Amino acid sequence: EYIRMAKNKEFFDALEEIAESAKNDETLRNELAKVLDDILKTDPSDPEAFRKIVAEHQEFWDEHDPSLMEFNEGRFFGKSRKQYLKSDDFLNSTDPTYNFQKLHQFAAEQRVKLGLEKSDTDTLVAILKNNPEECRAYIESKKPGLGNFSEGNVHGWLKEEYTPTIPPKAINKSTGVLSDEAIKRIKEQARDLLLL
Amino acid sequence: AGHRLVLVLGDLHIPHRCNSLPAKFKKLLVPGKIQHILCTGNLCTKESYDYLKTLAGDVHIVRGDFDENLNYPEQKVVTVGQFKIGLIHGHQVIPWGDMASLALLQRQFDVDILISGHTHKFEAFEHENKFYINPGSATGAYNALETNIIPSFVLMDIQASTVVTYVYQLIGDDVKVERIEYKKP
């Protein structure tokens, strides 16, 4: 409905699509996993690093959609391609709905969803049984299965915490990575998989 | 499955320094989970002892310098899983909590883990391949040098060659838990 010249929404929608195809294609699942892992290690608060990491997976993006990395460097006027890939008209940090934070969060949700698809009934039930904080810590327990969610490897991922109970339960408060809403949707997926 | 939960606490000093455990510790210390309780002493009376028995059947305790019960032993050595664990109140060591003294006692008892009290200051650390625990005071009772003490205790989760030590401390409005891990070399 809007008028935004940058590719922010494109990459979001492209990742949505690539994930549907990956439910069959194993080689694509592993390629997409790597891509998403690379986005998640990157700091969304650092616009330069974040443009660079999306930029360096150009082979992968071209396979799906050549329009994602398209830049029509016509004549000697307008921006350069080097300069374009470091700029807002490629991917802008102050986007009102798909800024780099939102894409980083989206990539986290997609990474868990990607590994959930082929995971066993016990795993899906663990997703359902746990509250959001227990769930985040459970995802960390399954690494790399549901992604490499751990300090260092996913940016903004917090140190594990322990409930004041006998015995303690592991919990994780990384709402900036996997929001309570993301977990709710992860749960919805786990349910759908148990109904297949 | 395979794990054993050991509550480690002491220096309650009930009733002469505190009337009770903090409401938040009471609430969380439920029966039917803990297998063994190792108490560093100075519960002070039978009332506290009978409370510990509500939490677990197997209660081990050593004599603190204010304990009413003269039947408790000075020290105790107890084997849990693969770990030999020594227990002593710690007023016997001078200066209090001294590392050279605690080290000597570890070697004297021949224990993998040495639990002691008396300082009202929680400890958990590896020193020279051996492990040392002080649960602090579960009531936050004043010691000889200080009031304004943080109530605390420890739960050990023992499995195989490994002991996971959880320290519970009441700080402001929350019980904060820390996790330290120790493997037998």
Description:
Chain B: Its main location: cytoplasm. The complex is a heterodimer of chains A (196) and B (185). Chain A has helices at residues 8-22, 26-41, 47-56, 58-64, 81-85, 100-116, 121-129, 132-141, 180-195; strands spanning 161-162, 170-171. Chain A has 196 residues and is mainly α. Chain A has one domain (8-195). In chain A, strands 1-2 form a two-stranded antiparallel sheet. Chain B is mainly β. Chain B has one domain (1-185): 4-Layer Sandwich (Purple Acid Phosphatase, chain A, domain 2). Chain B has a six-stranded mixed β-sheet, with helices on one face. In chain B, strands 4-5-6-8-7 form a five-stranded mixed β-sheet, with helices on one face. Chain B is globular.
Please describe the topology of this protein.
The complex is a heterodimer of chains A (196) and B (185).
Chain A: H1 8-22, H2 26-41, H3 47-56, H4 58-64, H5 81-85, H6 100-116, H7 121-129, H8 132-141, E1 161-162, E2 170-171, H9 180-195
Chain B: E1 4-9, H1 23-28, E2 36-39, H2 46-55, E3 58-61, E4 75-80, E5 83-88, H3 99-109, E6 113-116, E7 123-127, E8 130-134, E9 152-159, E10 162-171, E11 174-183
Parallel strand pairs in B: 1-2, 2-3, 5-6, 6-8
Antiparallel strand pairs in B: 1-9, 4-5, 7-8, 9-10, 10-11
PDB class: metal binding protein/protein binding
Keywords: Complex VPS29 RidL, METAL BINDING PROTEIN-PROTEIN BINDING complex
Assembly: dimeric
Main features:
heterodimer; A: two-stranded antiparallel ribbon; 9 helices; 2 strands; 54% helix; B: 185 residues; mainly beta; Purple Acid Phosphatase, chain A, domain 2; 6-stranded mixed β-sheet; 5-stranded mixed β-sheet; 3 helices; metal-binding (chain B); endosome (chain B); transport (chain B); host-virus interaction (chain B)
